[PDB]
């Protein structure tokens, strides 16, 4: 089964309890599926967002059509949509209770791998359509191999080490210099200024 | 507005100033570094063996011929014991000094095809060349003796 598996619109057992939109699941760096597993190429999420069944279908169809099943294999690194999103009826005034469940999404945090590909192939063969998929994803994304991912991580570390600016967001936030914690968020103490909402500023040091 | 917005939320001016002041500053390297200061050896042996074994050598520019015309010329040359050789100039240039051929340096530029042999059928080869009024015979060096075109003609006659 080398080709990418089908993803269902909603969980087979539908959720009954509406749940709050905890945007923290999109906010911040990703702590899961951040490393390669049984593959050499992948789509890395350089930002946060929700993946709909439409995005899943786009990824599946594009990758399946453009891959070589006898020499390439692909695997999801993101679960099927599970978080329920509720929409009220059009023309409804505010109030009257939380709306009924409309769709299911899967939260994705910046720094996570969405699809992982491997097999008897090199990056150049796959980067084309992986970049197509990444550009059509709801969040900033990039086709990255193991080597390129390590290269970008080492480049970030090098920039952090050799930055000539005496002042860093990390230092100022941690020390509460200028009383900037009045303007910053408690999450900023760990985001170090590299994350703003769902957006991940990669050039930010 | 929620903490996570579909658009890039406007930052408080103090946060904007913080982000501008804590920007990455690359290390300026003072003076720009930009303006500061198997097959090859196989064919080496091949050329050495060719030079040693062959008694007479000549060169030409067999590049203006079709595939079929070149094949026919090769057939006519193989009718005699003469063999046509093709080798890159990039690696032929060292061979002249290696084999002590100083006068051969200004002969191998651009396309060059050797015509190595021991028994000269140069008379019939020149006759074949005559009906094709191009592909001139180019200077060579028989048995460590450089011969010009007039030298080859005299030797043929």
């Amino acid at each position: 089964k080398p080709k990418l598996r089908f993803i269902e619109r909603a969980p087979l057992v539908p959720k009954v309890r509406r749940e709050p939109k905890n945007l923290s699941d999109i906010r911040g760096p990703s702590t899961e599926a951040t490393e390669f597993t049984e593959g050499n190429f992948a789509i890395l999420a350089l930002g946060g967002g929700y993946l709909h069944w439409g995005h899943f279908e786009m990824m599946r169809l594009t990758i399946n059509r453009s891959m070589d099943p006898k020499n390439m294999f692909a695997i999801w690194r993101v679960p099927a949509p599970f978080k329920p999103i509720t929409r009220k009826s059009v023309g409804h005034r505010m109030g009257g209770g939380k709306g009924a469940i409309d769709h299911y999404v899967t939260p994705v945090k910046a720094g996570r791998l969405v699809v992982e590909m491997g097999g008897r192939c090199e990056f150049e063969e796959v980067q084309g359509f992986l970049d197509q998929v990444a550009h059509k994803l709801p969040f900033a994304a990039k086709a990255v191999s193991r080597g390129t991912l390590e290269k970008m991580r080492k480049d970030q570390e090098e920039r952090e080490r050799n930055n000539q600016n005496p002042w860093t967001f990390e230092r100022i936030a941690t020390a509460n210099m200028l009383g900037i914690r009045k303007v910053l968020s408690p999450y900023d103490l760990t985001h170090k200024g590299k994350y703003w909402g769902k957006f991940y500023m990669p050039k930010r040091v | 507005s929620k903490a996570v917005t579909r658009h890039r939320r406007v930052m408080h001016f103090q946060r904007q100033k913080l982000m501008a002041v804590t920007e990455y500053i690359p290390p300026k390297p003072a003076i720009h570094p930009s303006c500061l200061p198997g097959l090859i050896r196989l064919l080496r042996r091949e050329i050495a063996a060719v030079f040693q074994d062959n008694r007479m050598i000549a060169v030409c520019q067999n590049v203006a011929l079709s595939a079929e015309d070149k094949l026919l010329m090769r057939h006519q040359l193989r009718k005699h014991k003469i063999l046509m050789k093709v080798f890159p100039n990039q690696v032929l240039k060292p061979f002249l000094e290696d084999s002590k051929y100083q006068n051969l340096l200004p002969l191998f530029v651009g396309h060059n095809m050797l015509l190595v042999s021991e028994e000269p059928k140069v008379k019939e080869m020149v006759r074949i060349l005559r009906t094709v009024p191009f592909l001139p015979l180019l200077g060579g060096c028989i048995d460590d003796t450089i011969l010009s075109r007039q030298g080859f003609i005299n030797y043929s006659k």
Binding site: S66, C121, E125, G128 | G38, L42
Partner: peptide
């Protein structure tokens, strides 16, 4: 060895073909 580099050239052509399958 001539055949060594002949095989190397064949493999390089194969790699180029695989890379250009999409290009």
């Amino acid at each position: 060895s001539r055949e060594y580099w002949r095989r190397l050239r064949k493999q390089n052509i194969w790699r180029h073909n695989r890379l250009s399958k999409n290009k």
